[PDB]
Amino acid sequence: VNKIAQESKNIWKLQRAITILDTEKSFLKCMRKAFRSGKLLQVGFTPDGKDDYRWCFRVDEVNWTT
Amino acid sequence: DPETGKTCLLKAMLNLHNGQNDTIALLLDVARKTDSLKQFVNASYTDSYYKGQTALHIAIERRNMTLVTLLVENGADVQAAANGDFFKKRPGFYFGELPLSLAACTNQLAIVKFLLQNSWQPADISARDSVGNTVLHALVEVADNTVDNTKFVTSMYNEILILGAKLHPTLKLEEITNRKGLTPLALAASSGKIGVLAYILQREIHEPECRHLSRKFTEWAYGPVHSSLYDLSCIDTCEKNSVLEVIAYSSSETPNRHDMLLVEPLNRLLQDKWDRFVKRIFYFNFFVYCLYMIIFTAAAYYRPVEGLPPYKLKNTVGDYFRVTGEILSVSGGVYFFFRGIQYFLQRRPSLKSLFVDSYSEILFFVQSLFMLVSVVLYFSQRKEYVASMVFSLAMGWTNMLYYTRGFQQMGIYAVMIEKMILRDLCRFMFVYLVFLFGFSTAVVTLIEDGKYNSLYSTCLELFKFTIGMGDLEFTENYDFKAVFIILLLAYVILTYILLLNMLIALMGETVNKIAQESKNIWKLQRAITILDTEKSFLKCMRKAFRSGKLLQVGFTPDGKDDYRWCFRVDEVNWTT
């Protein structure tokens, strides 16, 4: 009626997540370039005079309601 | 800057606070006093990523009316085209490359009106970008069929059309085609913009001097009853891209392919076409196919049982009727063969649409191929021509289900059969075949002789269990008996688990999914049938117009009359 479809989709997503983590954890060839979008200058103004880089992830979106 | 060509004015405009930056006026005044202002105000980027962007685009983007007014007053070119990679189809935003299209697409009506009818430099309402898209094409392009998007896009479209009518009474904006040869209506139909199509097909504009822009009119009104007229211009036929042809012959990637035929004029037009002349032709074709299959069956039933064809004919009645039937069957086969070739050449599919659409053409073509192979084997002195012939005969009966369309209930039933086979049975059969092959190999390995000496025989024997015709007697004296029993019990239990899971999985789909889909898929199939019948038509007389040539307004902006081939619909409303 409702249960099994939603439950099974989320369980499959969890299974694929475990597969991804297990794949990148061992990998048997020593590739360390698992990082994401890069050291973007997030703010550049810490409470001190220094700057910050955070290994950010980009997401783009559209909103027509202002 | 030398890298991008950005100047001081652009830097000042990109870094203003609370809508104000005093540096801009100082720059403009100093530019005016030095030598001139035209080369300074119209500065633009030179880098490829933001190529062509100038001050007007930034002013419009910031929603600052004062900067727009001042830039236009100072001689900025309102027809500047920004055609960088960021401004066309990665990150980006396509708005038609022009400030007028930019103002229209951002829902800034005041800037649109100012650009159209300012005192210094009015904008060209009929201008086209690099792709050939006008402002209305841009408005169609930025639609995503959501509620607020539909509201603002529809309102802006209506306002721009009325203003264009007022400024240029002799200009027909909707007749301007882009590089692909599409008008805004054809673009909306091909792209699946349901909301824009629904707005355009039945818009009513009741205002002085511009009511000729309407497509839905009122013929007369009694009290609760009244009669309305729909335009049908470029809906039925226009020789380039009609709405019905564009919707019906789409490539199946359009989002709203099934729903675009439910808008008010098209459903009634298709039903009228079905009831008028197409129904009789469809029934006649079904009758002829039935006669063909009866003759083929009778000719195949009474074949001779001698060896080494071809067979001689005796001076007797039965042989004459038999050979007549054979000749007619071969004629039908080659007819369907050439029809299939004509379909493939006239549509030019790319093997994706055939994979997900147009199955009946493939099945009829395969039937004809089997018939041709039968003929070739017959004249080559082979007995195997029978083996091909029966495969053309059996298919010849199942293809008769094609004619279940034209009857609503059987059509929905057949559509449900089709979708069940193509969605769920494939997923079932993959897993079932894996299990069957695995256990067949195990059984052949365990027992090397005595009905399990080959993989084919073992596969058949294990398949028999799935249909309730198994064999668990265990009469033979095998070496590995009592291990065989465990394997067979495990196989049976797993197979019935799989069948149970399939059955239950098909119950979650009966939550009012297949019925709503089928109700529209059948209608799309009937529409394709109607269009094909119109196209072939085998009469060479095209006087069968659909709704008659009525006078609709009789008064264009010029004094000439206005006839439009309108379609009548009666309506009743008790709420006033």
Ligand SMILES: CCCCCCCCCCCCC(=O)O[C@@H](COC(=O)CCC)COP(=O)(O)O[C@H]1[C@H](O)[C@@H](O)[C@@H](O)[C@@H](O)[C@@H]1O
């Ligand atoms: C001896 C061995 C015999 C094997 C025969 C097996 C059963 C034959 C049954 C024959 C029925 C004929 C028929 O009606 O064909 C069926 C296809 O059934 C199958 O799945 C066959 C699997 C191959 C419907 O296909 P249709 O041509 O209507 O295409 C649809 C478009 O029209 C529509 O606009 C939509 O785009 C929609 O998405 C499309 O699907």
